[PDB]
A paper describes a structure:
NagR, formerly termed YvoA, has been identified as a repressor protein from Bacillus subtilis that regulates genes involved in N-acetylglucosamine (GlcNAc) utilization. NagR acts as a negative transcriptional regulator, and binding of effector-free NagR to specific DNA operator sites blocks gene transcription. With more than 49000 deposited sequences, the GntR family of regulators (gluconate-operon repressor, Pfam family: PF00392) represents one of the largest groups of bacterial metabolite-responsive transcription factors. Their tertiary structure can be subdivided in almost all cases into two distinct domains: an N-terminal DNA-binding winged-helix-turn-helix (wHTH) domain and a C-terminal small-molecule effector-binding and oligomerization domain. In NagR and the entire GntR/HutC subfamily the C-terminal effector-binding domain adopts a so-called UTRA domain fold (Pfam family: PF07702) that is structurally homologous to the enzyme chorismate lyase.
In order to obtain more detailed insight into the DNA-binding determinants of NagR, we also solved the crystal structure of isolated NagR–DBDs in complex with an idealized 15mer palindromic operator dre-site at a resolution of 1.9 Å. Although the dsDNA fragment used for crystallization was designed to contain only a single palindromic dre-site, we observe not two but four NagR–DBD molecules bound to the dsDNA fragment in the structure of the complex. While two NagR–DBD molecules bind at the center of the dsDNA (as seen in the crystal structure of full-length NagR in complex with dsDNA), two additional NagR–DBDs bind at the edges of the dsDNA fragment. We propose that the two centrally bound NagR–DBDs show how NagR highly specifically recognizes DNA operator sites, while the two NagR–DBD molecules located at the edges of the dsDNA fragment reflect a considerably less specific interaction mode. The centrally bound NagR–DBDs interact closely with the sequence-specific recognition half-sites of the palindromic dsDNA with the sequence 5′-GTGGTCTAGACCAC-3′. While each NagR–DBD molecule contacts two contiguous segments of dsDNA, namely the nucleotides −7 to −4 from one strand and −3 to −1 from the opposite strand, sequence-specific interactions are restricted to the −7 to −4 segment and more precisely to bases G−7, G−5 and G−4. Thus, the wing motif reaches into the minor groove and contacts G−7 via the carbonyl oxygen of Gly69. The bases G−5 and G−4 are specifically recognized by Arg38 and Arg48, respectively. While Arg38 is located within the first helical turn of helix αD2, Arg48 extends from a similar position in helix αD3. Both arginine residues form bidental contacts with the guanine base they recognize, and the terminal side chain nitrogen atoms contact guanine atoms O6 or N7. The DBDs bound at the edges of the dsDNA fragment lack most base-specific interactions since only the wing anchoring via Gly69 is conserved.
Numbering used by the authors:
A (entry chain B), C (entry chain C), D (entry chain A): 1 to 75
B (entry chain D): 2 to 75
Amino acid sequence: MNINKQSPIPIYYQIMEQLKTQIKNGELQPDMPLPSEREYAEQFGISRMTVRQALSNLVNEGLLYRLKGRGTFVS
Amino acid sequence: NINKQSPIPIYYQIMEQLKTQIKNGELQPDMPLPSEREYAEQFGISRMTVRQALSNLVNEGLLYRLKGRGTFVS
Amino acid sequence: MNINKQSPIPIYYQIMEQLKTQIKNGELQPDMPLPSEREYAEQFGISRMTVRQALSNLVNEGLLYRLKGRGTFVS
Amino acid sequence: MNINKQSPIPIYYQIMEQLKTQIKNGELQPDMPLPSEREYAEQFGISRMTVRQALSNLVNEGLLYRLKGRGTFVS
DNA sequence: GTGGTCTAGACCACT
DNA sequence: GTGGTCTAGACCACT
Ligand SMILES: [Cl-]
Ligand SMILES: [Cl-]
């Protein structure tokens, strides 16, 4: 994955779309954990809350779920 | 109004306070809420802490936002 | 720092010129943050949009740069 | 600062004692922040909850105070 | 002059 | 060692 920080397109939305592709692809397996929020933040070089905005929307769209204390998973 | 020392998250306390204000007609359909910045100053908390409460109420359909203008009771 | 709201000279331009003065003599030190867009707007009693036009112009002239989520700095 | 995971002495207590030493000889001074709970946990290879037990005890004894979103500080 | 996005971290709750 | 909540602001999009 790669985000473009100088795009008017919000970083969180860029992340959303790329994750959506991997979900519909099987590149991210169902009931298997995504990389942690801190892993994503580190690799994208962005704030964890920016990552979280994306993940929270995908959770709200029913594409992911969270298990507190454990991780974030493909629905 | 809120208790910042409670284990109960601030944003949730705000949610319930607002829910309470919507029922007893202290807040009625289409009237505007104080700005996010007003709330944060009123409570001595961060604006994002206010936003978590308001976004949850928006997502629950109890409030709606007009981009660039304000937040209102549904 | 003063702005004249009844001058035919656009507010954003008045701001640009006073900021250039402060940059030139060092009242705004290089690589140090300016007052927030917020601070300028509230002090002058104007729109943030108007402040941004001034600031964006200076960014385009290479006098200032912006770092998202942190501030506006003198190059 | 060192811990021994194989000692019968609880890790959180080992941490408490060394922090008390560091405070007494001035390595940690009043109103200055400690390393983050994360920093301690990662460097010793332990859970944050273990670090938190040490820190919570020192807060309870009045030697440290915490500010949400900011840090942990010597009282 | 509001809501939207973002920074660069912190401590808290919890199999 | 994760997700959850929070700080204390900033600039960006926009009737
Ligand atoms: Cl602001
Ligand atoms: Cl952390």
